[PDB]
Amino acid sequence: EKKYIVALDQGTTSSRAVVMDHDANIISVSQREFEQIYPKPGWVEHDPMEIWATQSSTLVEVLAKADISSDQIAAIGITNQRETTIVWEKETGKPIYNAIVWQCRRTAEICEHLKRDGLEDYIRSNTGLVIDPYFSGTKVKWILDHVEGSRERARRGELLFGTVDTWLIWKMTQGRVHVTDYTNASRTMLFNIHTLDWDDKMLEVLDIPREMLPEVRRSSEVYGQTNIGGKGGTRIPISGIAGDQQAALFGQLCVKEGMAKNTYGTGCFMLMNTGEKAVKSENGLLTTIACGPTGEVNYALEGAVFMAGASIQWLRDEMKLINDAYDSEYFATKVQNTNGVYVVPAFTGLGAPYWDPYARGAIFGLTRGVNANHIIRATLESIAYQTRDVLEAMQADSGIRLHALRVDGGAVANNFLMQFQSDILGTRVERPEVREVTALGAAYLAGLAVGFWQNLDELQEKAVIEREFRPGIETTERNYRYAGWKKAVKRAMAWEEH
Amino acid sequence: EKKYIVALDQGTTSSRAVVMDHDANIISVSQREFEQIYPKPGWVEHDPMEIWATQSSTLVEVLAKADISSDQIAAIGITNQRETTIVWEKETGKPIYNAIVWQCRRTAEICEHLKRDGLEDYIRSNTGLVIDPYFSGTKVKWILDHVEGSRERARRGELLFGTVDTWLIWKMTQGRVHVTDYTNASRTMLFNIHTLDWDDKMLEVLDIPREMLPEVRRSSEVYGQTNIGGKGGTRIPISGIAGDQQAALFGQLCVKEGMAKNTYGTGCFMLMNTGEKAVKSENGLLTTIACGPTGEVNYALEGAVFMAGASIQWLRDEMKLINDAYDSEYFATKVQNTNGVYVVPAFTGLGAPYWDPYARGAIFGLTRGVNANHIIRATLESIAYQTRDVLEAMQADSGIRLHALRVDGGAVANNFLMQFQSDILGTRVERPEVREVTALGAAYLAGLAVGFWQNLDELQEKAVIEREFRPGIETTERNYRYAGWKKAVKRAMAWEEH
Numbered sequence: 002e003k004k005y006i007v008a009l010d011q012g013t014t015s016s017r018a019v020v021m022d023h024d025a026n027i028i029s030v031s032q033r034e035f036e037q038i039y040p041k042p043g044w045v046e047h048d049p050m051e052i053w054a055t056q057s058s059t060l061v062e063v064l065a066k067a068d069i070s071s072d073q074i075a076a077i078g079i080t081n082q083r084e085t086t087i088v089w090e091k092e093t094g095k096p097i098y099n100a101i102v103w104q105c106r107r108t109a110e111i112c113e114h115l116k117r118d119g120l121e122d123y124i125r126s127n128t129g130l131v132i133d134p135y136f137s138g139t140k141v142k143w144i145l146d147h148v149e150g151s152r153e154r155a156r157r158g159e160l161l162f163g164t165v166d167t168w169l170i171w172k173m174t175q176g177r178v179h180v181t182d183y184t185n186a187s188r189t190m191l192f193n194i195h196t197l198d199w200d201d202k203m204l205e206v207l208d209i210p211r212e213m214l215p216e217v218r219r220s221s222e223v224y225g226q227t228n229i230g231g232k233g234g235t236r237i238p239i240s241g242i243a244g245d246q247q248a249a250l251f252g253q254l255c256v257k258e259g260m261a262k263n264t265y266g267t268g269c270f271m272l273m274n275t276g277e278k279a280v281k282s283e284n285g286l287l288t289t290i291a292c293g294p295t296g297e298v299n300y301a302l303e304g305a306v307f308m309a310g311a312s313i314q315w316l317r318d319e320m321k322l323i324n325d326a327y328d329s330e331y332f333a334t335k336v337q338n339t340n341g342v343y344v345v346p347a348f349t350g351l352g353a354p355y356w357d358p359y360a361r362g363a364i365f366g367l368t369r370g371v372n373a374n375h376i377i378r379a380t381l382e383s384i385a386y387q388t389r390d391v392l393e394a395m396q397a398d399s400g401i402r403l404h405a406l407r408v409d410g411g412a413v414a415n416n417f418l419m420q421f422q423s424d425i426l427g428t429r430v431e432r433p434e435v436r437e438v439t440a441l442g443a444a445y446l447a448g449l450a451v452g453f454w455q456n457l458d459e460l461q462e463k464a465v466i467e468r469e470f471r472p473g474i475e476t477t478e479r480n481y482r483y484a485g486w487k488k489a490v491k492r493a494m495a496w497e498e499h
Numbered sequence: 500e501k502k503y504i505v506a507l508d509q510g511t512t513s514s515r516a517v518v519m520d521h522d523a524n525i526i527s528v529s530q531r532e533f534e535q536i537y538p539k540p541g542w543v544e545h546d547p548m549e550i551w552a553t554q555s556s557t558l559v560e561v562l563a564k565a566d567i568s569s570d571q572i573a574a575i576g577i578t579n580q581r582e583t584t585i586v587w588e589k590e591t592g593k594p595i596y597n598a599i600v601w602q603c604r605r606t607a608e609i610c611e612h613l614k615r616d617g618l619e620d621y622i623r624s625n626t627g628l629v630i631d632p633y634f635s636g637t638k639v640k641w642i643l644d645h646v647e648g649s650r651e652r653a654r655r656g657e658l659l660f661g662t663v664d665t666w667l668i669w670k671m672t673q674g675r676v677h678v679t680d681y682t683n684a685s686r687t688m689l690f691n692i693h694t695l696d697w698d699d700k701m702l703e704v705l706d707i708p709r710e711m712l713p714e715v716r717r718s719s720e721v722y723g724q725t726n727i728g729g730k731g732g733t734r735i736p737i738s739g740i741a742g743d744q745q746a747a748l749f750g751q752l753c754v755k756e757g758m759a760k761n762t763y764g765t766g767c768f769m770l771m772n773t774g775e776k777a778v779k780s781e782n783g784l785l786t787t788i789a790c791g792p793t794g795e796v797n798y799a800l801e802g803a804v805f806m807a808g809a810s811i812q813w814l815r816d817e818m819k820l821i822n823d824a825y826d827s828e829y830f831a832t833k834v835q836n837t838n839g840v841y842v843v844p845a846f847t848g849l850g851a852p853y854w855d856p857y858a859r860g861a862i863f864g865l866t867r868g869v870n871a872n873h874i875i876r877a878t879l880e881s882i883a884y885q886t887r888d889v890l891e892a893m894q895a896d897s898g899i900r901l902h903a904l905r906v907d908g909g910a911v912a913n914n915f916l917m918q919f920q921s922d923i924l925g926t927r928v929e930r931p932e933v934r935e936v937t938a939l940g941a942a943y944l945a946g947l948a949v950g951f952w953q954n955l956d957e958l959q960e961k962a963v964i965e966r967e968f969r970p971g972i973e974t975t976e977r978n979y980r981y982a983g984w985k986k987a988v989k990r991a992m993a994w995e996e997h
């Protein structure tokens with residue numbers, strides 16, 4: 002009867018839903034894009050409602066199309082886009098303000114003070130994090146700060162805070178349940194990653210009524226259940242929660258320290274499992290929470306690159322330089338190089354390991370003959386460059402050389418990118434079967450959490466290295482190119498006025 | 500010293516110039532487009548002046564780049580768009596009306612009369628022509644008729660009639676030379692292909708003062724010279740002239756009865772060398788003048804198809820369905836068939852063998868899934884269908900089965916087209932090296948006329964079968980498909996409101 006696990010993958014640009022079988026086979030999938038609100042340059046919002054809405058309906062759609070019923074869903078996993086923060090009225094469930102997405106750069110001023118009062122370490126030490134508008138804390142504060150009575154009501158606790166998983170879940174339970182998971186919490190900058198609870202100091206400094214937060218639980222547990230109709234008296238359990246990023250790492254099976262992958266998605270996300278030990282970043286990386294071999298706490302080192310697939314979309318939707326008929330790849334391969342062009346995707350400032358919020362998208366070394374294709378390619382390459390960036394610091398931090406790069410996310414389908422990536426890294430890149438582990442991750446979790454499965458062991462046999470990319474450019478080259486990349490990069494930082 | 504022949508190819512849509520070496524090599528080439536005026540639908544005009552200006556500059560251009568001087572041009576051959584008619588003031592050399600292009604369906608009524616007073620046969624018998632707005636006569640009179648004092652002045656002979664060559668030359672000789680060649684004259688429907696002179700009844704009938712006509716001469720003789728600057732006192736001989744079509748034939752070296760080609764240009768032009776004997780068409784083809792192996796007269800059978808490259812051109816500029824970067828072919832191949840569609844390029848009415856000036860472009864068989872690619876393709880196919888149509892008339896007329904289609908003209912570079920043609924024909928198609936034999940034809944003639952060459956033989960090994968296409972579709976297919984074409988064709992006929 003209950004033969005399916007269902008994953009809810011609330012992405013940055015679209016909500017998705019995946020139906021999974023015991024054989025961990027994708028049975029059905031649904032997608033719904035939502036609007037990317039840009040109130041003003043460097044600002045990114047989302048509709049708490051639109052999310053919810055798109056996420057729900059899909060959940061429904063997947064099943065529908067597949068002719069599956071509530072009563073066969075063994076459980077539901079949940080992954081989401083991290084850091085993007087939300088605050089609503091507990092009473093009404095009415096946001097008091099749009100979701101402020103992870104890329105949003107507005108919290109910079111605050112970050113500024115933060116810097117100023119010199120917490121660097123505290124934070125790093127307690128959160129694992131780096132001072133950035135990237136993270137939750139700041140966000141919230143801004144909201145409260147921005148809204149009239151907030152703080153009070155917050156304190157009066159009529160006000161509620163949450164990240165995606167949180168929100169979603171709450172919604173799925175008629176606000177019956179208000180919790181998040183570790184992976185998720187570890188990203189707010191209000192959660193102490195060693196102690197494993199909200200950081201008073203943290204809350205203190207940002208000024209955040211504890212009254213606002215949710216119950217932090219384990220990535221794979223039963224948090225509750227939801228009623229979506231069907232044959233009467235059926236409820237589906239919610240037994241899994243990880244931040245997308247972490248979900249992928251899990252889906253990827255990296256549950257053992259030194260295991261890592263790279264996710265080529267909205268941004269680029271490369272994480273490596275640091276076992277049960279927290280590892281300090283010396284290289285401008287993050288220290289976070291991940292999933293033990295069965296969703297228990299673990300840690301990992303992370304490199305966060307804001308712009309990846311996004312760049313591509315931008316090409317397509319903003320620049321209108323490609324369509325979905327004619328691929329980035331298509332064109333990119335029409336030329337044999339950027340023709341010296343470089344693209345600095347600082348569309349949302351920088352990020353690992355730069356962490357500049359004043360940085361802003363730039364294109365370099367243009368000539369009378371550079372054309373679209375050059376650019377397209379250029380864009381595509383930025384991705385890989387960045388990747389290198391973090392990959393490098395990672396060993397630096399990790400103390401470990403990666404023999405090959407594990408990847409995932411649509412972009413990985415881009416053979417070009419792949420190759421390049423490989424070249425430019427001078428490393429074997431391994432492209433698995435199903436590019437969308439992220440969801441498996443969540444499945445696995447919730448699935449595990451409910452005995453659907455006993456352990457990943459069974460799922461060993463699961464991963465298919467569909468392709469393998471080995472380098473084709475020699476060191477010298479590799480280095481040369483990287484250099485320009487580098488050259489480029491700087492010219493973009495500090496761009497934005499404070 | 501004089502080492503080069505130069506050919507002027509006055510296209511229907513662009514003037515060209517060509518430089519040839521004694522080895523009959525193309526040294527250089529220049530093109531210059533010009534405006535297709537369409538005063539109203541079914542009408543097609545040209546600015547004599549634009550025709551001229553473009554033709555001249557190219558002549559100049561071609562030499563320039565090639566770094567060649569007047570005093571090295573052994574001689575010049577002229578080739579041009581047939582039937583297209585011009586009338587100007589002898590005094591001033593000012594046209595008194597736009598050039599009426601061969602395509603222009605305006606003289607239809609007049610044509611209607613001619614019919615009615617039953618000259619079918621007479622015309623046909625002396626001209627070898629069919630009754631159509633295609634030919635020159637009607638054209639002339641229409642102008643006359645349309646412009647006030649004309650006739651008189653014409654009788655006063657202050658007015659001059661002429662075809663491209665005619666025009667071009669005068670101009671080149673500063674109105675010092677007013678002539679045409681046979682091939683040309685045969686298209687006026689005022690010249691007797693047997694007698695070899697202006698057909699009195701004809702003029703009588705159209706009311707066309709002999710006064711405005713020119714001395715007819717042979718295709719390869721010295722008509723005079725032209726001053727184009729350079730080393731003081733240098734004149735270039737003009738020693739060759741033929742309707743482009745005929746030029747082409749010659750170029751193809753179809754100088755013996757039974758030899759034939761298929762020109763893929765503005766429209767399609769398939770002519771078969773009928774030796775020195777005029778063969779009557781019982782199949783809706785024309786009987787015309789061509790050149791014996793020495794610029795002597797010959798005859799041929801012809802099939803004129805109004806829309807070939809022009810159709811594409813249209814696809815490109817009007818429909819904007821393709822470009823310079825993305826070819827007819829490009830898309831055409833994106834699909835496996837028209838998906839049932841058919842395109843009847845009656846844009847300018849219908850020609851051989853149909854001869855319906857009231858026909859107009861049409862597209863058939865649309866279904867919801869039909870797309871542009873289909874349409875593009877259908878368009879291309881149209882070419883081949885029409886080819887078929889005439890090819891068969893011709894073999895019937897001719898009584899022989901061509902063992903291969905020899906072709907030429909830009910479109911020939913189109914593989915898809917070439918294949919198809921072949922398929923639908925169920926015949927080998929022989930694609931030669933140099934698609935621009937029209938010009939050669941001319942070169943030859945002129946060069947011939949000046950001893951630049953001694954004779955054709957010299958030029959025998961000049962041609963190369965660049966590609967050979969062989970059928971790949973079955974009689975039934977071949978046949979089925981054709982039908983549809985035929986079906987469609989009808990539906991496009993008689994559209995025009997008399």
Ligand SMILES: O=P(O)(O)OC[C@H]1O[C@](O)(COP(=O)(O)O)[C@@H](O)[C@@H]1O
Nearest residue numbers: 175227228230231232233234235236
């Ligand atoms: O509506 P269903 O699925 O047919 O079952 C009826 C259920 O509705 C409820 O009244 C509300 O249940 P929940 O509040 O758990 O959603 C229960 O009392 C009852 O079991």
